[PDB]
């Protein structure tokens, strides 16, 4: 039996896709958003009379195991030097394994920092952190 | 909806296993690593629609005899609780909903609309394959059928599609109470010939992978964790031993119950203080 | 490094070839020569106002 | 591509072990630490092409008798799942690809090109030994042969080279589904003379090291972890005991399956809203 | 069987090489890169209209077990005093064990800090952190 | 160079143990803590060149009888892998080098130099005792001898020195492949008199300390970790029990192999693009 | 994010030229102008009826890290002693790095102030102040 | 930019530039919040730096400021 | 990175000399110049027609940590009382440490200000200000 | 590092004395001088031909933590009211702590400014400014 009213997402029901290509052996991803809320304090009140949105900052991180082929450097998505200046924006999509419907998409993603670890006793891993213009959860049912 | 994992394994395994053994091409892909001798001998025995020998599957402690030439054996195993929720609440629903189904249908020509018909009341729609209905299409559901408007879609009177939908039972809104259970189940292949057992185990691993795409697995039984034991003689008191490699399957699922609410507020009256 | 020192203006990165054969290696590469400024042609137009 | 580690051990061990015992110089390097008496007695017995005694290898629970003078015994051991991936996805491929091969070839003189020929279709090239083909060479693949242009390479009409390449089967693009498995396998040497066992174990350790350079090991079976038990009497009910030091080998590998895609989009039509 | 389409790098398929010399008993290495992305915020928008690259900073660390011979000090790659001023740049290469092809190379590496630990119950270890001008992943197939 | 720890223990123990028991002064220092009665009785038995009773040492499961009055018993024990390296690489060498040796020599008077001669080719020099050869000395090696210039060193024509050097075999440069192994080995003393066992164990602890200064231990077998069990009756089916306190010795060592390189580049030719 | 598509001039996109050469190791540059604006006031009302321009003042500042070669003193673009009287006017251009298009030009630059600093662990900083006759932004279109 | 757009000038062309009016506006409805009439330039400043964004500054002197059409 | 190859004068590369001796425990040094530049304006137009030089002002600053010996007061390069009238001009040189080549020289230096500080836990700081007649950068080529 | 071998006067090595007593709880001391240096200019050339000294200005500052006894007001070295006219000149010495050798002396010190502060949780700070006639550094050699 399978009652959809209580289902949740997991690692086996999600795909990470770039330019249609599913990135392989991807391990984890985290998303952050900051609206920069600030309160307004009058003289005759310790309490904040109201809150206001001021600034939108958002970053997304991706952890991956470096495949011998189609690594982020080979794919051209990342960069290692002045080649970065010629790299255009990208959109990173999280799409449902079952229906292939979209769960959340990040628009105008741009790379922030690049990390790779070479270790003796463990598989090679690399991490990338992007900064995006806007997020979207459209194209739903 | 208490989940009997043992029943689910049997329901999935029996059809899929027969299909895999039916054809030879898939078996070759599965047994690509094994040597020629073991690979073909197994294929000569069980593979193909014309296979005289056949595999069987059953639960433990049966009072009859099983085909010890090749057999899948299952036993329930341990269970544990891992994660809770506030008030043990999982979800809230406005409609009494059953299982989630996938059905295939062909569009029908109505006057203002094209409609698909399904075997049961639609309840909640989830997806129609590769259609992003716009607002001007005015997608809506009615009983056991789903409808979208005809104009600027006239090439699709014969559209053939798959539909994902839920079984509706009642309009009685209610809450869900339950928690998550981490359950382990054991599976083992049996034979009096070790080579058959190794081939049998490898076949099992593949269909477990294929089950990761199943509707029930994606929605209800998540987070596989597989563990394999060492090949051991299951039996020694006989003319020859029985050899089998046990495997352990872990699952995460919800033990849920439906609580119905009757306190529906419809009226709302304001009266000021007499003073 | 040479480009960073302005010794060479540009070059093709992908044009390099390397071949090894026992105790010998062959290396082939291309670099664009610098071009100097040679000709200027000028014309004048006189007008009223 | 389910990986049978037990078969891989046997495939690698049997040829390499025979080669090591064939010559004496390598054995001396292996047994450099051991005393003179044990070293030469082992060499007198098994070492050399003219050795009357010979070593054997086989799996556990055979119905026949093994050469208990000196024998390698293998048993499958435990297995565990360690790391997953999102959607269980590992990789995506545009071509159905099999094993990765290393082949040797000599350049052939065509008119515009020099070409190497290989036993099977090339599919994906990985490397030709110590050649960095420039763009002006215009390296390209065709069927079972790889070609590069002739000019300013004319000394190499007789070039003798090794090639690393993949087996191509189909143009059917598909995805990979699977996960990583942490597997343990047991290996033990057997003898009725303890000194032989110690020499036998040390020989094993060397070929395990050499296997670290193998193509299969580098690509499929990674992250060795070796563990040795204490020398014990395997048998006591006989005229003399059997002594053997078990060893445990650990591996990391992927249990992968191929999922084929047929939804290839080729056409793309834009139509504006009637309004 | 060995399908190359899914292979990944590990500690047993990588070599760390300096000036052609393979450094021995090397344990781990990490690489970092920072493009210094910053957003542009207009008056009439909380959202960042666009991101721009500003500054390239990159460091690589290496962990090693001090061999009695050919340690980083003996090799002349590191330094312990004013001898550093006469040390020229170096290039650190990560090369594939199987094919001897290059995976990533760091150009114009320069030393930043030097750490060595003498301990009673464990093997001696030393760590070096370099700062490099540019990275490269050329010379591929 | 696979290391047989068990053989190393026997090689070190047998000579050193005999030397320790040979003299009485060292034994008194070792047994300083013990009471007078036990100390002298042990000394009366085994100590001194004129000792009628003697200690023995051997490996486990021998087919003969051991001197159960006093005996050292060894058994190999467990082994484990602890630390790896990238590409399993340990070191690179330009010369095929064997063991590291310490030799004593006297300077010889040549015309321009004073030279020491050694039993084998020098290969890599490590140290000559308490000499810091300056550049004007022009220290150099030749075959099996090491030379330094004569001037302003003329008092040293008879210099008597110790030399630390390595065994050279070949000029074939090669790499080292291997890893570190954490190995445990068991040692136990046996007697039918508990007092002898305690004295015997204490003697063992001292020579283990002395082994910390040995060349092999300093270079190959590092990071001692000692562990002692409780005194127990090893045997009970006899006229009297056998008592012994087992000890466990741990080591860290490398399992190394030599890989030889033949791709020596000597020529280097530059050719410009035809364009 | 990309080189061409960024609507804003980052510091990277800009190049500074003098007399057919680039200025190496440039760090900063500022240009300030005053039109000598004034207000007209009369007896009738306090409010200023009109505004007019009186005098034109134009100055540009530059900072640089003293190279061991090609400094302003070495290159003759600046002078220390009485040789200044033998130095003519100079023209400065600020340039788009991509295409060598001109962004703004300073005509008739002459020196006002010249400053130099040395310090224990800092990089040698060379600063100079130029006063010019006119500033023009043409040849863009 | 102001130089490109002609709202500001560098050379003698300033004498050919007329007055300018600036408005500060409510984004939601394009209603006016405050207006500056008769703006004329006083100072113009520009900066370039290694890793910062190019900053353009300008100072305007005006004849009057009015806040009307709100009500 | 290397001593010779670095194109920029770090503080380390520079050495400061007075009267055939190095200055120990030097910390800072600054040189400022003003050519007394002015603009020419006339009735015809607001724009400055020309620029001219009027007066030459040159000052150099030095800071030093007061050694227990060889201070400026001890060494006679600076004076406290009326003895200043008996002190002649001084010439300062700033030197390349590698080769003792000259980088810049100050001629006719005479003292303007002399400052001294003492504090509980800081190092004693000695500062002095010199005004000079001319500054020349010759003998480099 | 050692007391005698350090070539630099740390704050610890120095001692401050007035009228045969040490000054307790001293915190800071600064001495500034101006020789009234000026440049000579003539019609012939812009460059200054010579420099001369006009007027001698000498001031010393001291800070102290107000002790409950032996303050400047208590000790008579400083005055608040009209009693200042009855106060003569004072001589200050800065001394080497090790050997009581003299480092520098101020002659004819007279007071200019006197400042005092009190605060909730800070230590009471007493400051005073002295103007002197001459400063001499003799008896060292």
Describe the structure.
This is part of a larger assembly, with 6 copies of chain A, 3 copies of chain B (275 residues) and 1 copy of chain C (49 residues). With 141 residues, chain A is mostly beta strands. Chain A has no helices and 10 strands. In chain A, strands 1, 2, 3, 6, 7, 8, 9 and 10 form an 8-stranded antiparallel β-sheet that branches. In chain A, strands 4-5 form a two-stranded antiparallel sheet. In chain A, a hairpin with a 5-residue loop joins strand 7 and strand 8 (102-119). Chain B is 21% helix and 38% strand. Chain B has 275 residues and is α+β, with helices and mostly antiparallel strands. By secondary structure, chain C is mainly beta. Chain C is built from no helices and 2 strands. Chain C has strands at 17-21, 24-28. Chain C has a two-stranded antiparallel ribbon. The N and C termini of chain C lie far apart (56 Å). At the A-E interface, strand 8 of A face strand 3 and strand 10 of E.
Work out the radius of gyration of chain A.
19 Å
What about the largest sheet of chain B? 7 strands, mixed
Largest sheet of chain A: 8 strands, antiparallel
> How many E strands of chain B?
16
Q: Quaternary arrangement of the chains shown?
A: part of a larger assembly
How large a portion of the residues of chain B is in β-strands, by DSSP E? 35-45%
Would you tell me the structural class of the helices and strands of chain A? mainly beta
- Give the topology string of chain A: H per helix, E per strand: EEEEEEEEEE
* Total count of helical runs of at least 4 residues of chain B: 5
The share of residues in extended strands of chain A comes to over 45%
Tally of contiguous helical segments of chain A: 0
From the spread of the alpha carbons, the general shape of chain B counts as flat
Strand tally of chain A, please? 10
Radius of gyration computed on alpha carbons of chain B: 26 Å
């Amino acid at each position: 039996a399978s009652e959809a009213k209580q289902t949740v997402h997991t690692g086996n029901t999600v795909l990470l896709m770039i330019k249609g290509k599913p990135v392989g052996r991807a391990q984890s991803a985290s998303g952050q958003r900051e609206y920069g809320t600030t309160g307004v304090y009058e003289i005759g009140s310790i309490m904040p009379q109201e809150h206001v949105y001021l600034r939108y900052e958002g970053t997304i991180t991706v952890e991956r195991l470096r495949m011998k082929k189609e690594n982020f450097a080979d794919l051209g998505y990342a960069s290692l030097g002045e080649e970065i200046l010629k790299k255009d924006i990208i959109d990173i999509l999280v799409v449902d394994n079952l229906t292939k419907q979209v769960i959340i998409s990040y628009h105008g993603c741009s790379a922030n920092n690049y990390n790779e670890t070479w270790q003796t006793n463990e598989i090679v891993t690399e991490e990338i952190e992007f900064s995006y213009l806007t997020a979207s959860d459209k194209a739903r049912t | 909806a208490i989940t009997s994992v043992d029943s689910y394994l049997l329901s999935e395994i029996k059809p899929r296993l027969n299909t895999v053994l039916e054809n030879c091409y898939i078996i070759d892909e599965v047994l690509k690593d094994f040597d020629y001798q073991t690979r073909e001998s197994f294929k000569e025995a069980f593979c193909g629609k014309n296979a005289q020998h056949e595999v069987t599957v059953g639960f433990n402690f049966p009072k009859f005899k099983n085909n010890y030439e090749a057999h899948y054996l299952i036993q329930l195993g341990q269970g544990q609780e891992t994660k809770n929720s506030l008030g043990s609440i999982q979800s809230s629903y406005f409609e009494a909903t059953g299982d989630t189904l996938v059905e295939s249908s062909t569009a029908i020509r109505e006057d203002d609309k094209l409609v698909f018909t399904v075997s049961k009341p639609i309840g909640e729609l989830i997806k129609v394959e590769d259609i992003e209905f716009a607002k001007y299409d005015n997608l809506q559901v009615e009983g056991n059928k789903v409808s979208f408007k005809y104009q600027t879609n006239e090439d699709y009177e014969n559209y053939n599609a798959n539909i994902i939908f839920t079984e509706k039972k009642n309009d009685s809104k209610g809450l869900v109470k339950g928690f998550t259970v981490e359950e382990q189940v054991t599976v083992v292949g049996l034979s009096f010939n070790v080579d058959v057992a190794r081939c049998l185990d490898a076949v099992l691993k593949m269909i477990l992978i294929s089950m990761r795409d199943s509707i029930e697995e994606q929605q209800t039984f998540q987070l596989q964790n597989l563990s394999f034991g060492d090949i051991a003689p299951i039996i020694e008191d006989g003319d020859s031993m029985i050899f089998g490699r046990p495997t352990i399957i872990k699952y995460t699922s919800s033990l849920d119950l439906d609580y119905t609410i009757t306190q529906d507020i419809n009226k709302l009256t304001f009266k000021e203080r007499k003073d | 490094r040479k480009k960073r020192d302005n010794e060479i203006q540009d070059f093709p990165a992908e044009d390099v070839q390397v071949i090894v054969e026992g105790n010998e290696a062959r290396i082939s590469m291309t670099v664009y020569p610098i071009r100097s400024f040679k000709k200027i042609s000028v014309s004048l137009v006189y007008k009223q106002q």
